[PDB]
Write an enzyme that holds these catalytic residues in place. Structure first.
Site, short mmCIF file in Angstrom:
data_model
loop_
_atom_site.label_atom_id
_atom_site.label_comp_id
_atom_site.label_asym_id
_atom_site.label_seq_id
_atom_site.Cartn_x
_atom_site.Cartn_y
_atom_site.Cartn_z
N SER A 167 -23.46 -50.35 56.80
CA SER A 167 -24.81 -50.77 56.72
C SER A 167 -25.71 -49.56 56.47
O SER A 167 -25.73 -48.91 57.69
CB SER A 167 -24.93 -51.78 57.69
OG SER A 167 -26.32 -52.60 57.37
N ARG A 168 -26.35 -49.30 55.45
CA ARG A 168 -27.27 -48.23 55.40
C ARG A 168 -28.57 -48.31 56.17
O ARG A 168 -29.35 -47.30 56.46
CB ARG A 168 -27.70 -47.74 54.07
CG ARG A 168 -26.36 -46.96 53.49
CD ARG A 168 -26.78 -46.59 52.11
NE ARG A 168 -25.36 -46.36 51.43
CZ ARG A 168 -24.99 -47.03 50.18
NH1 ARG A 168 -25.85 -48.10 49.63
NH2 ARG A 168 -23.73 -46.93 49.71
#
Ligand code: ATP
Lengths: 61, 271, 141, 131, 73, 56, 122
Positions: C2-3
């Site tokens: 999850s950036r």
């Protein structure tokens, strides 16, 4: 020996009496808690017995 | 569908590498526990050898006549072999049974009427598959080797020798001297010197270079083991002991303890 | 991955999320040692057991989505270790009973997790009390 | 208030605490030791080592060995000494019946000594697990 | 935060409002289940949900929409 | 001259008998204290399930 | 295969069967290269139960008796559930693996086990 032995038996018999009173409290606890919990299980059941009519109306529209 | 085949093969090789390094590390931890057991069981035998050396220096002119320490040279032989429990073993059980074959080869050639007391599970599997060699008892490692295995082996070797049936009860095992090379040794067990030292199959007192109490230290970045000469032994003093028991019976009750000590230490070293 | 990261969580979630992530990473590390769990250090056995009962609270049935307060309390219980004593076939049932109990009995916890959106010390104390109470009631079986 | 006592099996030290009165079942029979005993280094048969903690009398289950009395620092090197009473007598009598049973089948000359020692160890096990 | 209701996603792979997160997986591993759990979880929050059924079987979409109507989403 | 020490030992005798029956009563009363809530909790879930069948 | 469609007992035994087979599928390389003897106590039991389950999933067909050489069997749902519950409960651990091979139901598995033990004794 007699002081320690009478102390042991006395403390143990008073343990009988106080845990007997505590037993009375737990018997009342279970009876009262079943009297309560009957109501909540009937509550979720009647939630279903109403929600069936609710979804009936929801599809009636 | 060949690329999924190669992908699953690569995954299997990755998992096999992972579990092999896990086996390596847990085997190193169990090596540490084995050295713990050895250096914890040592001082019992330290006090035993100092007591026995003093007792036999007070008992040379006497007649002691204990059945364990007598020398009945009518030449039977009871060679006992202890091997590894489970597999992958490096090259443990193969060279053990190979030296066993070499020893029974020199033995049968001299007609000395040998026999075999197999201890390990791999060794006893080998012996039940090859019945051309005679064998006495069977032992295993599901039972704990620290107490009960050694006690049972000492009971059986004591019952073999005191009931004077066979002479020259020796034990073939594998002292941990290096992490890569583990050359087996043949040391005699019951036809012992009354002074109470471990001997060779020749008898030439290999306690001279027994090198007790191995330890593990890395040298540069890889694991090695260190073995020194002498540690925390105080054998010298010989105070007045005031024997209440008859002196022959004192050694008669002392020597089973030495049997158990030697058997247990050899089991721990082979483990 | 999850950036976005932890910026997509509330302040209550991050505190238990850090410990959950670290303990799950340690379990992922020691997953190979599970077949040799017997011959290991006590700290390693603890990390292995904590991992295989933290995996049990990440199981869910279809179409039963937990609110953020319920999952805050679940992650907190698991990551501290108020279920490090139970058996693997009991963690899910105990957590279901505990979640329903807390939602029914201690709504101050839900209100402090929802209105302030943080894991307050009062929420911690209320959750420890509810954990002890449901632990007694579930040891009753 | 007593002599230092260390009971030591081959693999470990069982317990090295000091207690008051010890009855040491030797090859010559039972003998009691006192705090500040003059040094007597005796043997020990497959038997019963009873102790006394000056608060309660306790037995120790051992399968033989050797003893040494020193200047209040006594050492007893034993074969198989299990601390206190770790067993109950039902499995003890289940071992007694099978030891006396296998005494019959084990009838060869070495099996005589072997079964006899197994019997003397089962008997000391049960007479130690009576308490 | 975008609450997906699944504790494993909400703690380990958190989704935010305005993020585009990929539910990538194999066949029949739970992708539609994860999306449907999120849409059901959006009940309390005021999120207008859209479900785009591309090339699905018509009875599959019928099952999904009847599950939506039953749960009230 | 005998009953005077007979009494002083019979006190310890009745004491140990009392402590034995006492420990028996302790385990029995704690068993019943567990049992009353266990019976309530079990039978309430029983009636729950049975009436839930007819509810479905 | 969802609980509200299929019944809780059916769903639970199916999930248990699939978990046992998946765990056996994952033990496949720790067995094949490192030895079945060194395995733990829980995993050896899992392996034996999975081999027995895999044998029990086979079943002779009425239109395939020309290939199996044995008459086909119709197996209702309840006897399937009861058979797999017997297998992974721990009762039938004393049966051979070949007792479960190409049998209709679990009583036929026990009967084939009896005949196998008869041939094994004499
Ligand atoms: N969390 C869950 N708990 C229990 N069952 C689940 C869960 N998630 C999915 N399932 C089950 O898995 C099956 C497949 O689910 P789903 O349709 O979500 O997968 P999918 O990837 O969308 O399938 P497809 O690949 O055909 O699109 C369904 O029967 C569903 O009941």
């Amino acid at each position: 020996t007699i002081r320690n032995s009478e102390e042991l038996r006395g403390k143990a018999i008073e343990q009988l009496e106080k845990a007997r009173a505590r037993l009375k409290k737990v018997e009342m606890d279970a009876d009262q808690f079943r009297v309560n919990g009957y109501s909540e299980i009937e509550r979720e059941k009647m939630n279903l017995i109403n929600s069936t009519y609710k979804t009936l109306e929801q599809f009636e529209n | 569908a060949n690329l999924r085949e190669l992908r699953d093969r690569i995954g299997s090789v990755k998992n096999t590498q992972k579990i092999t390094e896990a086996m390596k590390l847990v085997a190193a931890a169990k090596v540490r526990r084995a050295q713990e057991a050895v250096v914890n069981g040592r001082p019992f035998s330290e006090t035993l050898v100092e007591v026995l050396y003093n007792m036999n220096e007070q008992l040379q002119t006497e007649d002691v006549d204990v059945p364990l320490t007598k020398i009945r040279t009518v030449k039977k032989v009871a060679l006992m072999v202890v091997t590894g429990d489970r597999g992958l073993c490096g090259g443990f059980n193969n060279m053990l049974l190979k030296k066993a074959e070499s020893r029974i080869a020199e033995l049968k050639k001299l007609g000395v009427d040998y026999t075999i007391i197999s201890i390990g599970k791999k060794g006893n599997t080998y012996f039940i598959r090859r019945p051309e060699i005679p064998v006495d008892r069977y032992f295993d490692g599901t039972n704990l080797p620290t107490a009960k295995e050694a006690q049972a082996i000492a009971d059986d070797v004591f019952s073999l020798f005191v009931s004077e049936e066979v002479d020259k009860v020796e034990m073939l095992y594998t002292k941990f001297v290096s992490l890569v090379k583990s050359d087996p040794v043949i040391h005699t067990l019951l036809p012992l010197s009354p002074k109470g030292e471990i001997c060779d199959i020749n008898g030439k007192c290999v306690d001279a270079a027994e090198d007790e109490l191995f330890r593990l230290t890395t040298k540069e970045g890889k694991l090695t083991v260190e073995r020194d000469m002498i540690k925390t032994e105080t054998p010298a003093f010989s105070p007045i002991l005031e024997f209440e028991q008859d002196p022959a019976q004192i050694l008669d009750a002392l020597l089973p303890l030495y049997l158990n000590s030697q058997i247990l230490r050899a089991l721990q070293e082979s483990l | 991955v999850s950036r976005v990261g932890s910026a997509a969580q509330i302040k209550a979630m991050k505190k238990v999320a850090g410990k959950l992530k670290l303990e799950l990473a340690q379990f992922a590390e020691l997953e190979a040692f599970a077949q040799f769990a017997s011959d290991l250090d006590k700290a390693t056995q603890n990390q292995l057991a904590r991992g295989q009962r933290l995996r049990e609270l990440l199981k869910q049935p279809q179409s039963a989505p937990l609110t953020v307060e319920e999952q805050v309390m679940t992650i907190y219980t698991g990551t501290n270790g108020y279920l490090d004593s139970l058996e693997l076939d009991q963690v899910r049932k105990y957590l279901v009973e505990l979640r329903t109990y807390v939602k029914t009995n201690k709504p101050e916890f839900q209100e402090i997790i929802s209105s302030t959106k943080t894991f307050t010390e009062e929420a911690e104390a209320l959750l420890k009390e509810a954990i002890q109470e449901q632990m007694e009631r579930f040891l009753l079986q | 208030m007593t002599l230092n006592l260390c009971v030591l099996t081959p693999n470990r030290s069982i317990w090295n605490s000091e207690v008051k009165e010890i009855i040491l079942s030797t090859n010559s029979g039972q003998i009691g030791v006192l705090p500040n005993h003059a040094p007597t280094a005796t043997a020990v048969d497959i038997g019963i080592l009873r102790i006394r903690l000056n608060d309660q009398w306790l037995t120790l289950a051992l399968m033989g060995g050797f003893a040494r009395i020193g200047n209040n620092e006594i050492t007893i090197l034993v074969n198989d000494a299990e601390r206190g009473s770790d067993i109950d007598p039902q499995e003890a009598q289940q071992t007694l019946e099978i030891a006396e049973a296998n005494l019959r089948k084990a009838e060869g000359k070495r099996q005589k000594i072997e079964a006899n020692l197994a019997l003397r160890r089962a008997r000391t096990r049960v007479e130690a697990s009576n308490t | 935060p975008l609450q997906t209701g699944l504790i494993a996603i909400d703690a380990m792979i958190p989704v935010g409002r305005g993020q585009r997160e990929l539910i990538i997986g194999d066949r029949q591993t739970g992708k539609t289940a994860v999306a449907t759990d999120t849409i059901l979880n959006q009940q309390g929050q005021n999120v207008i949900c859209v479900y785009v059924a591309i090339g699905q079987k018509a009875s599959s979409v019928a099952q999904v929409v009847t599950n939506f109507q039953e749960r009230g989403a | 001259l005998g009953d005077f020490m007979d009494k002083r030992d019979a006190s310890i005798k009745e004491q140990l008998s009392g402590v034995k029956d006492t420990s028996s009563e302790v385990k029995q009363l704690e068993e019943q204290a567990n049992a009353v809530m266990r019976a309530a909790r079990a039978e309430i879930s029983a009636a729950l399930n049975k009436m839930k069948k007819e509810t479905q | 295969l969802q609980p509200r469609i299929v019944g809780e007992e059916h769903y639970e035994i199916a999930q248990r069967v699939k978990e046992t087979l998946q765990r056996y599928k994952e033990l496949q390389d720790i067995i094949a290269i490192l030895g079945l003897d060194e395995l733990s106590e829980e995993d050896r039991l899992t392996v034996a139960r999975a081999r027995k389950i895999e044998r029990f999933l086979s079943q002779p067909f009425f239109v395939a008796e020309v290939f199996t050489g044995s008459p086909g069997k119709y197996v209702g749902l309840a006897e399937t559930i009861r058979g797999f519950q017997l297998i992974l409960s721990g009762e039938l651990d004393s049966l051979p693996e070949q007792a479960f091979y190409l049998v209709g139901n679990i009583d036929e598995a026990t009967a084939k086990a009896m005949n196998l033990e008869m041939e094994s004794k004499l």
